Amino acid sequence: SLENVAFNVVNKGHFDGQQGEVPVSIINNTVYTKVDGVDVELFENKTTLPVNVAFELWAKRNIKPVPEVKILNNLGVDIAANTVIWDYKRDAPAHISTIGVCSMTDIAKKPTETICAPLTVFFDGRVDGQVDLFRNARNGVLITEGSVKGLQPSVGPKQASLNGVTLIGEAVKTQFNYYKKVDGVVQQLPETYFTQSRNLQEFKPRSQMEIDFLELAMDEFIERYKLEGYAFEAIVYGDFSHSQLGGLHLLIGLAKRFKESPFELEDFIPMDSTVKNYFITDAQTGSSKCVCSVIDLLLDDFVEIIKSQDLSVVSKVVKVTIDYTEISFMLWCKDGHVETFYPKLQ
Amino acid sequence: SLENVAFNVVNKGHFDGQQGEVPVSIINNTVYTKVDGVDVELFENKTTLPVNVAFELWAKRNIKPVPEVKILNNLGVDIAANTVIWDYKRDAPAHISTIGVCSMTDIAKKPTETICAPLTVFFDGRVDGQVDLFRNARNGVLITEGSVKGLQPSVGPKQASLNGVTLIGEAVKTQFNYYKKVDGVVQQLPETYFTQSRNLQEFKPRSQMEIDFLELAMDEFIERYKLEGYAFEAIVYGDFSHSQLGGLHLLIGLAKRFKESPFELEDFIPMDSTVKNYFITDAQTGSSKCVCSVIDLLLDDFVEIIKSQDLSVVSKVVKVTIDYTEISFMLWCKDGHVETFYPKLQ
Amino acid sequence: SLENVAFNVVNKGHFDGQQGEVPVSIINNTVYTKVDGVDVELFENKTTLPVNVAFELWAKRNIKPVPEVKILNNLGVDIAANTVIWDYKRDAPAHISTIGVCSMTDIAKKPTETICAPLTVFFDGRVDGQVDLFRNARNGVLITEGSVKGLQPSVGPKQASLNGVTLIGEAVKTQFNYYKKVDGVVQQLPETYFTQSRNLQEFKPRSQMEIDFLELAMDEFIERYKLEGYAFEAIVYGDFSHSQLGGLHLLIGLAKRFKESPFELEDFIPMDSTVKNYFITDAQTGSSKCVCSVIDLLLDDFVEIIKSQDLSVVSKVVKVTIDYTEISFMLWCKDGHVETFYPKLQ
Amino acid sequence: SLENVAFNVVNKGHFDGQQGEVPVSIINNTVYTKVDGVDVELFENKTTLPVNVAFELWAKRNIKPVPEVKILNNLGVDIAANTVIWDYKRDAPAHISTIGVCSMTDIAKKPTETICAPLTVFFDGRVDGQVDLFRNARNGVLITEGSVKGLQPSVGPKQASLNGVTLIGEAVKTQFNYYKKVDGVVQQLPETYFTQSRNLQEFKPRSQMEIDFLELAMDEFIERYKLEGYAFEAIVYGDFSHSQLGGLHLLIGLAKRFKESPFELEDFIPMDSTVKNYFITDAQTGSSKCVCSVIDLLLDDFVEIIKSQDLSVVSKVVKVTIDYTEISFMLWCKDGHVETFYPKLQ
Amino acid sequence: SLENVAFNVVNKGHFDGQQGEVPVSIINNTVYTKVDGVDVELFENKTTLPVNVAFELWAKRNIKPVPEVKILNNLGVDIAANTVIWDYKRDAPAHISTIGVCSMTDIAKKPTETICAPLTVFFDGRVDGQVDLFRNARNGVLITEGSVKGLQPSVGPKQASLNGVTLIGEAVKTQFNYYKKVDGVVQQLPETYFTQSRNLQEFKPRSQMEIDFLELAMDEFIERYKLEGYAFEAIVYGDFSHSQLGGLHLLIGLAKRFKESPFELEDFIPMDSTVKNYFITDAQTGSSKCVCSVIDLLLDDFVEIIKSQDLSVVSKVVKVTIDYTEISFMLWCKDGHVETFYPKLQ
């Protein structure tokens, strides 16, 4: 019930299944509740769904640490089992349909129904009975905080999403084991690098090499870590000398530049992806690139990736498994050294 | 509950207090329900209220014969006791607030609370206990289908409103006895004429004089009923010879003209009133008046009113009690005969 | 393209696949085009879809005679193959998804894809290759204007829908042969009666018994056709003597009453169904029923149905196959004669 | 002022320049006023303009007989001098800009400013000083009810538009003399036929030939008026024997067909033009044409036009001056008789 | 007038009663004005009121230092006398109705009318004649910057709200004397603590103990101020070791934590109250509580409150008068020391 959902929201901050109702008014894609005679905004609908439907899905969103939406997208997750994964990047539910959550968006009450068999259902082992549900599911992705009998685990990212806050858990567990079934057969998830899901204005180094990159100058870091011939001056640090911005394809380089000269990042596709494209405008020099592909990889991981390449090729597409998906990089080299390395197709 | 209100609407045509819910989507000031996977419109909000609030008030509207909104307005009714009077002219609730109906519009649960004491509460004797509630109310209007002990009744209009259909009841009782209390004192409602609440395109004569007016020509009807010197040719039949339309202040004359030449009536204040103002454009001659005051009185009643006037005055304002309210008419006369008679202030 | 769709609409009345564009402005769920410098409304979105999506689906609607939406719903049709069935009752597409029509609503380009296998796809034999597509479809409904090799046909209703106009075709063929496949197996469609899809204000008799019903009085028609003991006075003609309206469950009886006394029909679920529920208010007597189940059966067909019943039962649920679906009727009888016969569950 | 405009609307039906204000609430592209504590709708914005701007322009619309919008469009009128021409077909102002009417839409206060020199300003001689303004205007169209010194008049249509009602005036003058200036030079308006601006459901014959067409059968009318060899059976009466509707390009033929069999006319470009295109669906036969060009010419005028053609040509484009604009007709003939005659380019 | 209100807004920043008008366009719940031919946004309606009504109320808001909305709510203020109190937390007027401000929201022109007698009217002594109006008011709250003859004052908070900025005035007076009348009798306002209305990201200590709390560690501050046995480690500093966040019920503790580790505060009821509830998510540890009751009391005041309690009780509800209202705290103790102290009912 709309009024019951609003009662739960005003009294517990989210839907907890408590009984009770409050007066609700809907207007301008917004849900208001009346507190002491004055209307108070509870929810502004930013989705393509009806306002009441979006309000109910947002109230019933998972408030426990959940995998980032990019991870679920790369795993082909189409729907979640008896929960709502809220996409905080889009301010919308991460999946079109639900299973036993909202009457307007449900396609089934339980993930065992025939409509969910072709779909890759997301299962959370922390909920009782979902491991068995995944065991009997034709297609599904399972996350657990521990081991599963007879199933080889895939270690996921250290970080997870908690109410829209991406963090590495200390008081809560955010590292999950990932399991995937396709057509009833348990798959072996590929060995992968993971993006760190960091922010430009709140960048924090997670390794010694990243610390050195942030504090040391360009030449000192390049010489210290034996990174001559890999075009780190352009790929990571970025070139701001021409009207068209060069390189700057790692979030750590953008953060280092932002520390000295705050610039502009236009996120013209505001969603959660392994590779993010930005319309970057440098506020100090005026160098700008309309499509700048940025990936937030650990600098140690990116150094390993670039050093594992074969430099004796002019043009070559590099396939790297990042966040359980294959990211294709363009590798331009000359005279046995790198001239360019960015995610292709920007 | 919104969903429960919609369940009642889809299963019973209105709110009947039945338990159950249906999937509901709200968009574009419209309430949709999902029937077999496709959204079906249940209600389009034409009010100034929030869409869900208006939907709930419309579902809980009185489906029994109720007094016309103009009658309640003339009696000073500000609010109804535990019911919603729906104004079908405005497609909106007839009163801003409610008593024990909708959480968003309620000012009280029962009419006995202190907030309802200054307000003139509408009481329906057909509902059990409302006669006693009116007896203890400081201000109120009571309607009954029978007598009330110790209270002198006022006979109201023969017709009432049934789901937006104004009719004189045959299988149901539409004539009510009216009682009014002001500051705890029972008032004597004035003797009044009543408008017939008829429509232009569905006009039906309710008296022999009206039949004669509709069939007989102007001169024959005027001579037959001894109506010489009262300007019936202009006041009732209307003058379509000049660019500015003359007279035509009785609905029966407009209906007679519409039978021969269908014309235009712009209702620029679409509400329920004893006197209606129209922007009339005659489609045959081009005569038009931007403000034409029309009252739907019984022709026999209007003849009595015009013949009860004193013709030996040049200009005089005539006060007639119509629908429990005082309607002021302008009476222009010359040489002991009427030149004009219309509701004043148009 | 939105602009190309609008170009086709302004130049051909619907989408015909012609190249060209016109200036388009979208506002207030409405599509406007500019003709000679002034904006002209092309489409008002009454659906739950985005305005541009609904505009494109409406432009690409089938303009050939198509089965009524109620027939497709009773056959379990979930989606149409490479066409849009427009539901003119709801002013919306009859199906949520499309196959190769609109990028925003498509789930597949051709009905042969895996996503369409569980769905009952609607196939039109008048389109080249759709008979073969239906032959290879797991679930589907096929309509043809002629015979299909090896497939036993089911004769459908005489009438079809042509641009929202239900008619029995003379210059065009509106009677179709119906074929159904469930899980790859051709089904035998049950022998059924068909509703006539007539309107109250435009009722036309399609049989001699209907003509007699319309012209003859109650007693004369009942005695002429040997209809004593089947409660035709209540079930068909209707009882307007009490406050609660009695019977009136056939559209022909409502039309006969409307001819003498125009009344009110509130269609509180405005969709296309075999059985329609109305909030009926009789304008002459005041008799009203909030839920009146009305079915537009041929009077000869209804007489056969009521005479095929076993009168020696007090209460019995009658299952009649109407419009390829099972309609359940309540049959109350006493002393070997009918007291009541209406669609159950109103 | 918005509130002053609403005061004028509620007290006079339109803007009359009276002082005073009323409480106004704007919501959902609708202007509401509060009468006795309840909001009453004054105006629903159907234009592309802001709701308050459209409300002000609608209140200040010309309430005197004005030329039909199609006539002003054919004369190239871009703007009106100190008045608003309301297009009742579109429920919008006929011109984008105004001169001294509304602050949001004004481009000038008087038509003498430099911005109005390239524009063809509409002048009304019935307003004092507008004849002199037109005399000094570079581009303009003048209408008068009488003669103008030194200017040769062009006799316009007998009918005009009065508050959205097209009529031939009896108590008011609706026939105007038309004058046009282009680049400061008085033009000679071409001799033209005029459309009658009649409606399908309210068709009234304006000539003896039209009366005969309506009452007499096809063969009798064709033989009586010597109309053999001009394909009147198809062009005017229409062919309903095939799936594609044939002919029916005169409003009188559509009205004659509508008298016997009411059909469907989808006006997919709802504006005012000399030639109207309809998506016609015949409800009796099923014959339908998505683009049917219909012109409402006097039948005597159309007979003269078709008889003034040279029948000894296979294909020929006929240019007819109708409503001060050149309408191009396609004329297909064989063996010295007409096979087809419709407005070209439908 | 809407246009006059907009003129005042564009020329003075708010309504000052100046004459003049500017072109105004209303669309999408937004008021635009035209400056040099381009529309400029003046106001975005975030209220439940009509856009023009909300715009007028916002323009006429009090721009002088006014009591915080929480204070007026705790005093039972229902309406303000001839002024608008704008609630900047909700971006809406603090009261539903007005007295002599806006025609659409006024219930009276002066606070002396009968409709305002049951309501607690807010009076501002800084406006001439409002002290006398409060003297004759049945129910009211009066604020003055000085003494009132014969009335015992209540010293209010040091801070007030100035155009949405809460500050302790230096060039202006923000400390008011408060007076309350209920049913015509002057009340004695209870002795109370006052919240400091500080922000998390702009926290500034207002006492020496607060400075020590911010700079000193947990153990040093607890030992210095003799705060052993009152569970300051949990109640104020907060526990971030478990998945469920513990304590953290004082804004100073949240600010201290935010200084070291910026976290998330979801204000799911965005209004002004003495006790605020937040959905807190700690970005460093992952500890989160969906309902965290936070009160911004002076740390010296909270120490006095917690030390004035009787520790020899297991469970006890503590009633503290804060901001002229009774705040109920839960006090759990064991072995003569505090285990928990938070506002109850979160």
Numbering used by the authors:
A (entry chain E), B (entry chain C), C (entry chain B), D (entry chain A), E (entry chain F): 1 to 346
Recite the paper's sentences.
Nsp15 limits the abundance and length of poly(U) within the negative strand RNA 5ʹ-extension by trimming down the initially synthesized poly(U) lead sequence to the optimal length that can suppress dsRNA formation but still serves as a template for poly(A) tail of the positive strand genome of the coronaviruses. Nsp15 C-terminal domain (CTD) belongs to a family of endoribonuclease with two conserved catalytic histidine residues (H234 and H249), which serve as general acid and general base, respectively, to attack the 3ʹ-phosphate of the target uridine.
SARS-CoV-2 Nsp8, a previously hypothesized cofactor of the Nsp15, was also added to facilitate the Nsp15-RNA interaction. CryoEM imaging shows that an equimolar ratio of Nsp15:RNA resulted in mostly apo-Nsp15 (and data set 1 in Fig. S2) and that an excess amount of RNA with the Nsp15:RNA ratio of 1:10 yielded a complex with the available RNA binding sites within the functional oligomer of Nsp15 occupied by RNA (data sets 2 and 3 in Fig. S2). Multiclass ab initio 3D reconstruction showed that 37% of the particles belong to RNA-free apo-Nsp15, and 39% belong to Nsp15 in complex with obvious dsRNA. The apo-Nsp15 was reconstructed as a homohexamer with D3 symmetry and refined to 2.3 Å resolution. The hexamer forms a barrel-like architecture with a central channel, which consists of a head-to-head stack of two trimers (defined as top and bottom). Comparison of subunit A structures in its RNA-bound form and its apo-form showed an r.m.s.d. of 0.388 Å, indicating that the binding of RNA does not induce significant global conformational changes to Nsp15 protomer. Superimposition of the apo-Nsp15 and RNA-bound subunit A structures showed that the C-terminal end glutamine residue clashes with the flipped uracil base. In the RNA-bound structure, the 344KLQ346 patch swung away from the active site pocket, allowing the substrate uracil base to fit into the pocket.
